[PDB]
């Protein structure tokens, strides 16, 4: 539990950095002394001065959402697994395996994705078929944004 509360601190302090920067440097930067004349959201100032892609304050908010989701993911992954071990009775699962990252991939993600993935098998289908369909539906929408 120690390592995660510190890893959560990485999210809040760096997510704040991205958003604080886009605010204070909203009025002007050395690369763009007058951002205030253009607006909150504009694409760029051109390829000149070495390149000016993603300077506007909108582009700072844009990049922070990736960290917002990463931060809340760590916060939420830590809630679920610590509670599953409690509900299953085997608290020793989290204490010994949450210290190294293969435990998260083996014991939390890979293991608990068994009943879900068999929602629609070639033999039959359970009541969890709607969730496995949605489970891929999100693995697809995520990729289309790339």
């Amino acid at each position: 539990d120690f390592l995660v509360h510190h890893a959560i601190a990485l999210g809040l302090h760096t997510t704040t950095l991205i958003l604080v920067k886009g605010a204070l440097d909203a009025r002007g930067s050395k690369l763009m002394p007058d951002k205030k004349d253009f607006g909150y959201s504009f694409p760029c100032d051109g390829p000149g001065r070495g390149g000016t892609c993603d300077i506007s304050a909108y582009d700072a908010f844009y990049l922070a959402v990736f960290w917002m989701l990463n931060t809340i993911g760590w916060v939420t992954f830590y809630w679920h697994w610590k509670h599953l071990t409690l509900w299953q009775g085997n608290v020793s699962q989290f204490d010994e395996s949450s210290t190294y990252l293969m435990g998260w991939l083996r014991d939390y993600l890979w293991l608990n994705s068994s009943q879900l993935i068999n929602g629609y098998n070639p033999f039959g289908m359970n009541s969890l078929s709607v969730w496995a369909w949605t489970f891929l539906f999100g693995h697809l929408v995520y990729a289309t944004g790339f």
Binding site: K30, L31, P33, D34, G48, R49, G50
Partner: protein, 64 residues
């Protein structure tokens, strides 16, 4: 003479400039009434790659 001496270092006071509160050599000064006569040269480049720029009398001050 209208302005600073040739070869004299001066400090810039344009807030817009890449060279703000920084020092550079005076290359030349024009005495024909131009608004921005003082030509200054710095060692460090700006973002584009230019190391010179014409500044004004009020925009420059003595070193340090």
């Amino acid at each position: 003479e209208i302005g600073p001496k040739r070869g004299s270092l001066v400090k810039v006071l344009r807030p817009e400039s890449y060279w703000y509160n920084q020092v550079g050599k005076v290359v030349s000064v024009d005495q024909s009434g131009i608004r921005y006569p003082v030509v200054v040269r710095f060692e460090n480049q700006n973002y584009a790659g230019v190391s010179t720029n014409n500044y004004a009398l009020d925009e420059i001050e003595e070193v340090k």
